[PDB]
């Protein structure tokens with residue numbers, strides 16, 4: 001991984017030791033990227049709803065993962081399921097239960113630093129995984145990206161600054177998540193998020209993440225070329241808010 005410090009260094013060290021699992025995938029790969037593009041063509045707002053029980057940026061919410069995913073299946077373009085355990089209270093069992101229950105695309109969000117974590121995502125039923133530029137070297141990014149594609153997965157590349165975006169382009173990213181939240185400081189900077197979006201080629205699928213809570217924000221980001229919107233804590237607290245955000 002990169003040279004890190006503090007809690008980011010901690011979660012990366014823990015992820016390096018994450019025990020792998022054994023299971024049989026019993027699901028096709030259902031591409032998040034393609035379904036975004038399909039929603040864009042049908043002029044349907046594409047919201048990726050996040051399931052996360054805990055985070056550094058919110059209070060805990062303990063709610064049924066299957067109900068949440070079944071409710072979201074009718075509205076969301078895909079689901080993001082947290083599997084990081086210490087800081088997000090996620091689990092691979094959340095992802096397994098949800099993947100077994102619904103047929104929309106699923107992104108496993110975790111600090112992916114080794115190949116066995118991509119095996120775990122594939123074997124559990126995730127369609128894609130988050131590759132976070134803040135923690136991975138160029139060499140690690142290129143290698144894990146190729147390994148995920150060997151399973152037929154197209155990872156989402158997570159960025160929050162210009163240097164991250166340059167690396168995401170260098171590695172041939174096809175879907176980028178532009179998060180307005182800095183993973184180390186938890187600051188939300190939407191001016192920087194718009195500047196990053198303006199520098200991404202038109203043929204890369206763009207997902208805006210963090211701090212989105214209003215239909216007016218979505219409309220304005222769509223007009224700037226954003227293709228989909230990752231929305232977490234607002235929907236964890238009030239899942240049915242998705243109906244209004246898509247209207």
Ligand code: NA
Nearest residue numbers: 016017018019
């Ligand atoms: Na290990």
Ligand code: NA
Nearest residue numbers: 090091092093
């Ligand atoms: Na787990």
